[PDB]
Amino acid sequence: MLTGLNHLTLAVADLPASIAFYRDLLGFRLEARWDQGAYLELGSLWLCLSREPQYGGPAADYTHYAFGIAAADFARFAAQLRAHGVREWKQNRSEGDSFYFLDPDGHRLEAHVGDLRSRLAACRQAPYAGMRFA
Amino acid sequence: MLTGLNHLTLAVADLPASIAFYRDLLGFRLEARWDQGAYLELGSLWLCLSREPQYGGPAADYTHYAFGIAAADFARFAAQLRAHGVREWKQNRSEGDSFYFLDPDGHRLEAHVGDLRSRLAACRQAPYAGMRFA
Ligand SMILES: C[C@@H]1O[C@@H]1P(=O)(O)O
Numbered sequence: 001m002l003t004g005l006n007h008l009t010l011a012v013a014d015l016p017a018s019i020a021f022y023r024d025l026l027g028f029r030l031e032a033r034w035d036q037g038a039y040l041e042l043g044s045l046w047l048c049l050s051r052e053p054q055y056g057g058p059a060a061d062y063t064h065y066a067f068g069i070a071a072a073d074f075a076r077f078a079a080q081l082r083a084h085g086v087r088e089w090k091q092n093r094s095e096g097d098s099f100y101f102l103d104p105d106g107h108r109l110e111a112h113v114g115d116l117r118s119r120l121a122a123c124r125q126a127p128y129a130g131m132r133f134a
Numbered sequence: 135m136l137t138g139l140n141h142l143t144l145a146v147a148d149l150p151a152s153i154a155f156y157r158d159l160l161g162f163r164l165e166a167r168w169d170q171g172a173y174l175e176l177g178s179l180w181l182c183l184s185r186e187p188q189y190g191g192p193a194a195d196y197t198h199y200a201f202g203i204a205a206a207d208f209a210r211f212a213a214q215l216r217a218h219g220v221r222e223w224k225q226n227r228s229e230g231d232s233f234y235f236l237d238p239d240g241h242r243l244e245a246h247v248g249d250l251r252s253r254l255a256a257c258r259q260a261p262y263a264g265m266r267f268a
Pocket residue numbers: 062093094184
């Protein structure tokens with residue numbers, strides 16, 4: 001069977017800028033760097049940055065990558081990145097604090113308080129349209 | 135500060151088709167579905183499918199999502215998805231077996247044997263160009 005998420009790989013046009021963003025601004029640990037990429041870790045997440053100098057960023061769509069944060073740290077994180085001029089791409093509407101921000105290439109990120117279990121519980125108490133649980 | 139990956143959200147043009155692909159071909163568990171999305175889980179991975187009917191699939195770039203698989207299971211998985219007519223987008227060149235295939239929208243997926251530690255260990259015996267390690 002498949003076991004989970006093994007790694008997330010992001011195309012990046014400016015590898016140095018993306019390393020700085022994920023490591024220095026977001027707190028990922030840089031584990032390796034080479035002329036065409038970097039490997040970083042956050043908790044159990046393996047992030048690969050693959051250098052693609054002609055990359056123009058993603059299509060405009062809902063695809064996005066959310067990282068967890070503790071409730072007590074949310075407000076400070078959102079304020080830190082806002083003060084650092086990071087661009088937002090969405091305003092939170094769903095259960096649990098969320099800050100929706102763009103990376104240097106325009107990959108859509110989120111910092112979120114909550115998990116699947118808190119989402120399903122909130123949803124059972126107030127179901128989305130047509131919602132069915134399984 | 136940030137703790138890891140909280141969830142992966144994919145834009146999907148055809149929500150029923152994507153549910154069946156992730157559940158039935160890739161073995162995710164369907165936890166909830168509503169008119170505009172679904173929540174699934176594989177291991178610790180929270181996958182959200184967000185219905186976006188005019189989505190045309192991603193840009194052609196290196197961005198991709200890899201799921202783990204055990205060495206002994208690899209060949210059967212690759213064979214099964216090929217027999218089912220899944221399209222491939224890349225040929226493996228790096229440490230650990232990998233099968234690189236597209237989802238119904240063209241999101242780039244991978245089934246991979248190994249992890250960050252096995253990659254780092256392999257890279258230290260045979261480093262990529264310019265490679266430096268923490
Ligand atoms: C992605 C779908 O538009 C909705 P939401 O952002 O309000 O959940």
